Design a protein around this ligand. Structure first.
Ligand SMILES: *[C@@H]1O[C@H](CO)[C@@H](O[C@@H]2O[C@H](CO)[C@@H](O[C@@H]3O[C@H](CO[C@H]4O[C@H](CO)[C@@H](O)[C@H](O[C@H]5O[C@H](CO)[C@@H](O)[C@H](O)[C@@H]5O[C@H]5O[C@H](CO)[C@@H](O)[C@H](O)[C@@H]5O)[C@@H]4O)[C@@H](O)[C@H](O)[C@@H]3O)[C@H](O)[C@H]2NC(C)=O)[C@H](O)[C@H]1NC(C)=O
Ligand SMILES: CCCCCCCC/C=C/CCCCCCCC(=O)OC[C@@H](O)COP(=O)(O)O
Ligand SMILES: *[C@@H]1O[C@H](CO)[C@@H](O[C@@H]2O[C@H](CO)[C@@H](O)[C@H](O)[C@H]2NC(C)=O)[C@H](O)[C@H]1NC(C)=O
Ligand SMILES: *[C@@H]1O[C@H](CO)[C@@H](O[C@@H]2O[C@H](CO)[C@@H](O)[C@H](O)[C@H]2NC(C)=O)[C@H](O)[C@H]1NC(C)=O
Ligand SMILES: [Ca+2]
Ligand SMILES: [K+]
Ligand code: NA
Ligand SMILES: [Zn+2]
Ligand SMILES: [Zn+2]
Length: 788
């Protein structure tokens, strides 16, 4: 119980913690219904609006006004933001020329540049193109500070998961806010964007920026605003807090606007109606900057202007209905719209038949505008599986479409789609002493920002999913010096130690300083050997055409590395070598796979990491058939892999002036995005202990300067990578009955990945020996080739 009888006298938007029975006056009291009786009265004044007029200058201070234009207002810290322009002949901030801020220029008492995070909801990256004609203040921030062309949100591309990701540096599967709405089967409770349950702390994982700041003795302003508090008041409040005594003043502030999201939904992203809300946001930004200038803080504070996600054209006419596919949709609950999550209407309902449901949802219409996935099969780049609040059955919906349960309009826009979709990209601008001046940076992911905000505030970040240092290039100072992880397992270099006669593996090959190092490593291992960051036992193996790190535990390479010149020739597998597998005298029969298992497993076949198709000579091709180059592959997967090995790698070489390729297996049976330990592997080749990868990766590197060959690159690198799911069928690809040239690349693009993703999944550390800085390499590793 809270005693509302109290008063907010001299307490408006106080920063101190106040719990029952005491009544509150902070920006979240209305939301808790615990405001003092005179909160609305004393704290939400509205009299006379938000701007000084000439006729108010040098007025007698009336405490009833929303803001003041009286001569004392500056000391009290509650002038209207335009007071000086209207009353003291100053200029708006926007009208001032841009000037580089080389060091913070802060008033007496300021020890560090405050950080103000200005978040806008549903601000599509492309809105920035509207420029100073529509958004002059924002355009000044963008052009004079540091900007990316866009920032990638997390999936699903909705507000709650993204704002909390910004605050924590975590994927939703880790922070727990996996949707605007979600059901937790252990709580047996439902979280809704609107409603009381969301206020319970049990839902919120990780450690958000305000807690991190607080725990390290840095004071945070509010990161929540009651919907009823108008934007102009949020701005006046932040400015008031910045005018506080040195011993009360916060170091970090957040502003939030629900626009242009609301108008985007109503009118669509390209609607002429979008101009007004964009003008209004820019006006708010100008109030903030005018206010800061008034406080002599405009060259002191760091400002981040940042969106949570974009906005797409979506209308009523583009809705798929599950009732068209399924006989009884009244028995399921669907989280609908721009994504789908399906569970039984009755929790744990035993009659729920997910295999039959998925069957009926799989490639049933030629133009089907969604695709069902068991969550473990979703592209790994989405990182959207390892949480109990994520339903097993998911629908990835096509951009511009909705999925609904059944047919039983006022919107032209929505968002929530796959986070690589162009329309979902959002905005990032940093402006202030700590950011660079007039600098553009490549697009990056919102998970990276928490580390940077910690850097900007002198905080040590809690464990998170950013890669600390990957965004050092945004900053003039306060960069984070990263440190190369130490290798845990050194390799063995096995020489010959066995004779063909030592092997009883069931392999047959109907035909018949070798494997010494130089110069294999300098040709095929361009950026150093991957460091193995876990305890295990493996061998380096050299070959004319490729090098590998062969695991004696998992009985196949952890990685296989090779270079293909632009000029390289593709060759066939000779008829007599079709089924050729050869034992490897370098590796004990006890640490080898046996072809008997393959011969005997009627569902599992095999493939090779280095493709015989790319052998340098008929002689060298024989290396490609070694048992130590072989991996277990379903025939379905082989359709994809052979096309990749025989057509695509060469195509990449030709297009990129040669490529270096590192390929290998990934084991993630528990779908947590991390290297499986032995205990967690659940499938082996029939009758054997050969483990079956859940995915196969390839990392393809070349010279950013394409005029230089990949093997002779003097500068920055270009990288594209994939994590392909290892599945017994191609049900994912609706056109897979056709020739591979019609569907394989489409599948690969969907499963594009960052090198960093592969690192988490393999426990390997790449690019350790290059001519680039460690920070540049971290940037390279977070890169995602999106194909948009
Ligand atoms: C993205 O970055 C994050 C953060 O580093 C990584 O997530 C971490 O993974 C490690 C290794 O698996 C886990 O370590 C285990 O920790 C548990 C105990 O963990 C408890 O205490 C910690 C510290 O206070 C707390 O963070 C944990 O919070 C989890 O559980 C909460 C309560 O249920 C929940 O509110 C919160 O959202 C979070 O849930 C998530 O993680 C759990 C697994 O712990 C998972 O089941 C759930 O679905 C969510 O994904 C928890 O109270 C020990 O018992 C183990 O021995 C081991 O030390 C960390 O717990 C985990 N941290 C967080 C915050 O998620 C990701 O791996 C990384 N992803 C990628 C792809 O790199
Ligand atoms: C480190 C911080 C970076 C993030 C800063 C976050 C500031 C968050 C909050 C500020 C003020 C209080 C309210 C915050 C949540 C507002 C949620 C909401 O208003 O969503 C409305 C709507 O759009 C929801 O649906 P979608 O947009 O369709 O997903
Ligand atoms: C709820 O709030 C009011 C205001 O503080 C409390 O009323 C005061 O109670 C004290 C103690 O009896 C009186 O001496 C004061 O004169 C009261 N203040 C005013 C201005 O009315 C009330 O006690 C609180 N309710 C509780 C404590 O349960
Ligand atoms: C999957 O779709 C089929 C239709 O292709 C549904 O089949 C119907 O099933 C009911 C009883 O289950 C029969 O009376 C109808 O004759 C079937 N329709 C047709 C056109 O054959 C099936 O029910 C669907 N399964 C699920 C789980 O929704
Ligand atoms: Ca795992
Ligand atoms: K077989
Ligand atoms: Na198919
Ligand atoms: Zn939003
Ligand atoms: Zn929205």
């Amino acid at each position: 119980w809270t005693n509302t009888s109290g008063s907010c006298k001299g307490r408006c938007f106080e920063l101190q913690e106040v719990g029952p029975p005491d009544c509150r006056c902070d920006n979240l009291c209305k939301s808790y219904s615990s405001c003092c009786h005179d909160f609305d009265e004393l704290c939400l004044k509205t009299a006379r609006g938000w701007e000084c007029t000439k006729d108010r200058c040098g007025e007698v201070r009336n405490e009833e006004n929303a803001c003041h234009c009286s001569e004392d207002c500056l000391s009290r810290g509650d002038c209207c933001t335009n007071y000086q322009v209207v009353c003291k002949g100053e200029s708006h901030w926007v009208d001032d020329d841009c000037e580089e801020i080389r060091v913070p220029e802060c008033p007496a008492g300021f020890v560090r540049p405050p950080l103000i995070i200005f978040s806008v909801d549903g601000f599509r990256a492309s809105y920035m193109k509207k420029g100073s004609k529509v958004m002059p203040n924002i355009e000044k921030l963008r052009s004079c500070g540091t900007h990316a062309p866009y920032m990638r949100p997390v999936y699903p591309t909705k507000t709650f998961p993204n704002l909390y990701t910004l605050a924590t540096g975590l994927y939703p599967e880790s922070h727990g806010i996996v949707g605007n709405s979600m059901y937790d089967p252990v709580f047996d409770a439902t979280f809704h964007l609107r409603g009381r349950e969301k206020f319970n702390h049990r839902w919120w994982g990780g450690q958000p920026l305000w807690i991190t700041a607080t725990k390290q003795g840095v004071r945070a302003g509010t990161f929540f605003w009651s919907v009823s508090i108008p934007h102009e008041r949020r701005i006046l409040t932040i400015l008031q807090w910045l005018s506080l005594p040195d011993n009360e003043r916060p170091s970090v502030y957040a502003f939030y606007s629900e626009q242009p999201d609301f108008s985007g939904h109503k009118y669509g992203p390209f609607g002429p109606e979008m101009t007004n809300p964009l003008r209004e946001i820019d006006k708010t930004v100008g109030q903030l900057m005018d206010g800061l200038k008034q406080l002599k803080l405009h060259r002191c504070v760091n400002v981040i202007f940042v969106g949570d996600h974009g906005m797409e054209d979506v209308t009523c006419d583009r809705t798929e209905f599950l009732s068209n596919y399924l006989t009884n949709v009244d028995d399921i609950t669907l989280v609908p719209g721009t994504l789908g999550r399906i569970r039984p209407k009755i929790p744990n309902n035993l009659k729920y038949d997910p295999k039959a449901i998925i069957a009926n949802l799989t490639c049933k219409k030629p133009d089907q505008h969604f695709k069902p996935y068991m969550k473990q099969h979703l592209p790994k780049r989405l990182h959207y599986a390892n949480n109990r609040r994520i339903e097993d059955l998911h629908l990835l919906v096509e951009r511009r479409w909705h999925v609904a349960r059944k047919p039983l309009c006022f919107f032209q826009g929505d968002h929530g789609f796959d986070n690589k979709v162009n329309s979902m990209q959002t905005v990032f601008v940093g402006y202030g002493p700590t950011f660079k001046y007039r600098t553009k940076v490549p697009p990056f992911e919102n998970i990276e920002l928490y580390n940077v905000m910690c850097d900007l505030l002198g905080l040590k970040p809690a464990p998170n999913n950013g890669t600390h240092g990957s965004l050092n290039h945004l900053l003039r100072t306060n960069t984070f010096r990263p440190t190369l992880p130490e290798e845990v397992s050194r390799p063995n270099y096995p020489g010959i130690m066995y004779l063909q006669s030592d092997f009883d593996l069931g392999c047959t090959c109907d035909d018949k300083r070798l494997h010494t190092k130089g110069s294999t490593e300098e040709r095929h291992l361009l950026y150093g050997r991957p460091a193995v960051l876990y305890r295990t036992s493996y061998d380096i193996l050299y070959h004319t055409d490729f090098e590998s790190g062969y695991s004696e535990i998992f009985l196949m390479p952890l990685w296989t590395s090779y270079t293909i010149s632009k000029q390289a020739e593709v060759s066939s597998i000779p008829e007599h070598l079709t089924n050729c597998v050869r034992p490897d005298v370098r590796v004990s029969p006890g640490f080898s796979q046996n072809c008997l298992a393959y011969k005997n497993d009627k569902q599992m076949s095999y493939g090779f990491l280095f493709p015989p198709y790319l052998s340098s000579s008929p002689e060298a091709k024989y290396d490609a058939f070694l048992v130590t180059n072989m991996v277990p592959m379903y025939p379905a997967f082989k359709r994809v892999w052979t096309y990749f090995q025989r057509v695509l790698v060469k195509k990449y070489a030709s297009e990129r002036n040669g490529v270096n390729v590192i390929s290998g297996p990934i084991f993630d049976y528990n779908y947590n995005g991390l290297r499986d330990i032995e205990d967690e592997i659940k499938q082996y080749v029939e009758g054997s202990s050969i483990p079956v990868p859940t995915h196969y990766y390839s990392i393809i590197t070349s010279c950013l300067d394409f005029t230089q060959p990949a093997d002779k690159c003097d500068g920055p690198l270009s990288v594209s990578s994939f994590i392909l799911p290892h599945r017994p069928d191609n049900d994912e690809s609706c056109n897979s009955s056709e020739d591979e040239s019609k569907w394989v690349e489409e599948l690969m693009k969907m499963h594009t990945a960052r090198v960093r993703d592969i690192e988490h999944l393999t426990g390997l550390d790449f690019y350790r020996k290059t001519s680039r800085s460690y920070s540049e390499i971290l940037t390279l590793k977070t890169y995602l080739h999106t194909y948009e």
